[PDB]
């Protein structure tokens with residue numbers, strides 16, 4: 001009844017990735033993954049500790065968690081892989097058993113204040129009775145492409161993790177019709193070393 005992974009019984013993440021394809025992939029294809037989730041109870045982290053890193057007026061982590069449901073709420077810590085005029089992409093995929101029309105907002109936040117939001121819709125495809133929600137190869141919003149290139153040219157990774165300590169993403173998934181929450185995901189970030197590639201730990205947010 002406790003989650004084993006990033007999802008409810010109602011809506012679950014199949015896959016998420018932010019990536020870059022260099023322009024020479026048109027000949028000899030090759031992708032770089034900044035972060036990547038591909039899909040034993042998860043460890044929990046108290047949500048009140050993480051209020052700092054997200055805004056607190058509306059669509060902030062307090063008021064959504066007050067609004068619930070609590071089991072839809074997750075924290076992901078990413079270790080971003082930051083070594084690599086190509087294409088910059090985000091691909092996300094969810095799965096259900098209801099036929100819903102999803103709305104996915106992504107709040108990019110800085111010192112816990114919203115800087116960019118992207119709000120997409122996806123209706124389901126029926127595949128194996130299981131219903132499938134594909135938001136694939138979405139262009140990365142230019143704030144975060146430019147953030148990456150600024151970030152990557154820092155001379156020390158403690159400077160990078162100093163920056164990313166004040167950098168968060170809140171991703172909010174709702175049924176478009178019923179206006180009810182399905183899955184809300186806070187993201188906190190570090191830079192992994194060069195030898196490491198991308199990695200993640202997934203938590204429940206409890207209160």
Ligand SMILES: *C(#N)N1[C]C2=C([C]1)C([N]C1=[C][C]=[C][C]=C1C(F)(F)F)=[C][C]=[C]2
Pocket residue numbers: 018034035078080090106118139140141142144145148169171187
């Ligand atoms: C813009 N458009 N977006 C929407 C959106 C983005 C960027 C992310 N970005 C993300 C997630 C994890 C690690 C790195 C990044 C990025 F793109 F480099 F900032 C996630 C969700 C939605």
